[PDB]
Design an enzyme around this catalytic site. Structure first.
Site, short mmCIF file in Angstrom:
data_model
loop_
_atom_site.label_atom_id
_atom_site.label_comp_id
_atom_site.label_asym_id
_atom_site.label_seq_id
_atom_site.Cartn_x
_atom_site.Cartn_y
_atom_site.Cartn_z
CG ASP A 36 68.05 65.98 -41.08
OD1 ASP A 36 68.68 66.08 -42.14
OD2 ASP A 36 66.80 65.88 -41.03
CG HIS A 59 57.27 79.82 -43.36
ND1 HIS A 59 57.72 80.58 -42.30
CD2 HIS A 59 57.61 78.54 -43.07
CE1 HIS A 59 58.31 79.80 -41.41
NE2 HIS A 59 58.25 78.56 -41.85
CD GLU A 92 56.12 65.79 -45.77
OE1 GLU A 92 56.98 66.62 -45.44
OE2 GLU A 92 56.40 64.77 -46.41
CD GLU A 125 62.15 70.40 -48.06
OE1 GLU A 125 61.36 70.42 -47.09
OE2 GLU A 125 63.20 71.07 -48.07
O1 LIG Z 1 61.63 61.71 -43.40
C1 LIG Z 1 61.34 62.58 -44.49
C2 LIG Z 1 62.30 63.75 -44.53
O2 LIG Z 1 62.28 64.35 -43.23
C3 LIG Z 1 63.08 65.53 -43.15
O3 LIG Z 1 62.95 66.03 -41.87
C4 LIG Z 1 64.55 65.17 -43.42
O4 LIG Z 1 65.35 66.35 -43.35
C5 LIG Z 1 64.67 64.54 -44.80
O5 LIG Z 1 66.02 64.12 -45.04
C6 LIG Z 1 63.73 63.34 -44.91
O6 LIG Z 1 63.76 62.86 -46.25
#
Ligand SMILES: OC[C@H]1O[C@@H](O)[C@H](O)[C@@H](O)[C@@H]1O
Ligand SMILES: [Ca+2]
Length: 516
Positions: free
Chosen positions: A97, A292, A367, A172
């Site tokens: 982040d 996991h 993803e 999530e």
């Molecule tokens: O971009 C989609 C998601 O990516 C993640 O890596 C972030 O921690 C989330 O805050 C974000 O909603």
């Protein structure tokens, strides 16, 4: 693919946008050039977080959708589609982040109690997302936000491919059970997050509702609690994960603990559909985290998933189905390890989840958990995506391939593909009663030469007297394949003599014809 089928005909590739605003990373004109480049590489849409902290910053109903509208205009300019994520969670604090956008500060003032946030086993307070227990506040705020967002995006309906909701931390559907501050970051066991006074009372009332009174609760649990106040969540989280979960009390606590997430799913799902259906008529989805580690730990089985709220995936997925939400899973790029000390089984996790979703008829999306710097991971993603009926795959994240043409090219080749229906015909197959014919090939779309669980099944055409099938292949890619016969007992009887190829698979539907 699994069960004699091919890849999903609806398969699309998506690209995650940066965490920060575009003007903070580049400029609108360059962003548009980038979108046209991603589109050139097989990406159908760009997913993007629109932070609650940005949209309703100053106070209740003091909305600002100007950035989201501007973003949409550029997407329209580039000739692309977008998938907005109404991010009611905080940006910052999670792995990967690079941002800092907490939810609106005024929100916390709506309650005098501790119903809005989380408190771990050891008293660690979490405020990166609203506690799903406070459904009254959630219904009001999310209902209001979703409705205002729909009105603001109405003009750009045409570029909106689908909507993603945020079910919790990092977007999530789960509890914030693994954090550095709580001392529960990977690969440690997680801690339960139901230790606020509000959470204790809710559990207490849930139990008395199910049983009626303490005399019935003690009968059911085989316990000797002296008063109702003694009805509490696990005192020792580790001991609970070790054996407490096996008791009736344990089963009850986990039913309630996970149940809160299921109810939340149905609520935000109802609000979303009410807000977006009539206007956009697009699919709506939410995400389930890929926890996991501590999966196959012998002493604390699934010690990381349970504290996150995942006790029974089948029952959790039933909630998505009833809520009419598509599901997104992660970790498609990883392999099973399952060794001490991490006990990480990401691939097994994914396979099971995909199987449940597929049998329940829930549209599945995937993803990658971490950034991919080598095409080998693209290969792993391809195996899971194309053999487990994934309807889509979203790449994290923009910068990784936008500024690396080499990686971008490998992505296009392996995952930025367009599914095209083709007919494969094989003549002169020497079969006998009980024999079935299959095809397998070099690419992941063809099962990667696997004959055990990934081959594509053909069927006998009584009229033309041959074996053929309407197989979905990746358009414009060179493929190599061979047909083979499987005996009634399920073993490989023989193989087609010469190896077949299609260089490349044509863009329009045709048919490949070959003799055994
Ligand atoms: O971009 C989609 C998601 O990516 C993640 O890596 C972030 O921690 C989330 O805050 C974000 O909603
Ligand atoms: Ca509001």
């Amino acid at each position: 693919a699994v069960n004699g089928k091919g890849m999903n005909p609806d398969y699309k590739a998506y690209l995650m946008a940066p965490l920060k605003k575009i003007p903070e990373v580049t400029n609108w004109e360059t962003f548009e050039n980038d979108l046209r480049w991603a589109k050139q590489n097989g990406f159908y849409a760009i997913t993007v977080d629109f932070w609650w902290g940005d949209m309703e910053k100053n106070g209740d109903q003091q909305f600002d959708f100007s950035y989201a509208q501007r973003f949409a205009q550029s997407v329209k300019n580039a000739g692309m589609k977008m998938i907005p994520i109404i991010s009611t969670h905080q940006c910052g604090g999670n792995v990967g982040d690079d941002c800092n956008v907490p939810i609106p500060s005024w929100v916390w003032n709506q309650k005098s109690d501790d119903s809005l946030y989380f408190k771990s086993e050891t008293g660690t307070v979490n405020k990166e997302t609203l506690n799903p227990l406070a459904s009254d506040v959630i219904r009001k705020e999310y209902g209001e936000l979703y409705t205002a967002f729909a009105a603001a995006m109405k003009p750009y309906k045409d570029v909106i491919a689908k909507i993603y909701l945020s079910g919790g931390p990092a977007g999530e559907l789960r509890y914030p059970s693994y954090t550095t501050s709580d001392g529960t970051g990977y690969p440690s066991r997680g801690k339960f997050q139901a230790y606020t006074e509000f959470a204790k009372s809710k559990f207490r009332l849930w139990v008395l509702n199910k049983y009626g009174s303490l005399n019935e609760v003690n009968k059911a649990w085989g316990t000797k609690l002296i008063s109702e106040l003694a009805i509490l969540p696990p005192s020792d989280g580790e001991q609970f994960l070790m054996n407490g979960y096996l008791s009736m009390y344990g089963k009850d606590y986990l039913e309630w603990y996970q149940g809160i997430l299921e109810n939340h799913t149905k609520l935000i799902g109802e609000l979303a559909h009410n807000a977006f259906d009539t206007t956009f008529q697009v699919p709506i989805g939410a995400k389930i985290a890929g926890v996991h580690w501590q999966y196959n730990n012998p002493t604390i089985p699934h010690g990381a998933e349970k504290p996150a709220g995942y006790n029974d995936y089948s029952h959790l997925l039933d909630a998505f189905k009833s809520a009419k939400l598509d599901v997104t899973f992660t970790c498609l790029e990883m392999t099973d390890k399952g060794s001490y000390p991490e006990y990480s089984m990401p691939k097994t996790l994914v396979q099971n989840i995909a199987t449940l979703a597929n049998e329940k008829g829930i549209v599945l999306n995937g993803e990658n958990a971490l950034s991919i710097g080598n095409e080998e991971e693209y290969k792993r993603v391809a195996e899971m995506a194309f053999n487990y009926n994934f309807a889509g795959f979203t790449l994290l994240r923009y910068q990784d391939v936008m500024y690396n043409n080499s990686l971008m090219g490998k992505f296009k080749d392996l995952l930025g593909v367009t599914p095209v229906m083709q007919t494969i015909v094989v003549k002169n197959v020497p079969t006998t009663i009980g024999d079935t014919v299959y095809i397998t090939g070099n690419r992941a779309e063809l099962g990667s030469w696997d004959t055990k669980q990934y081959p594509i099944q053909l069927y006998y055409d009584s009229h033309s007297n041959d074996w053929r099938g309407n197989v979905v292949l990746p358009a414009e890619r060179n493929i190599e394949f061979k047909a083979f016969i499987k005996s009634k007992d399920g073993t490989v009887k023989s193989w087609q003599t010469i190896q077949q190829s299609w260089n490349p698979v044509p863009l329009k539907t045709t048919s490949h014809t070959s003799s055994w």
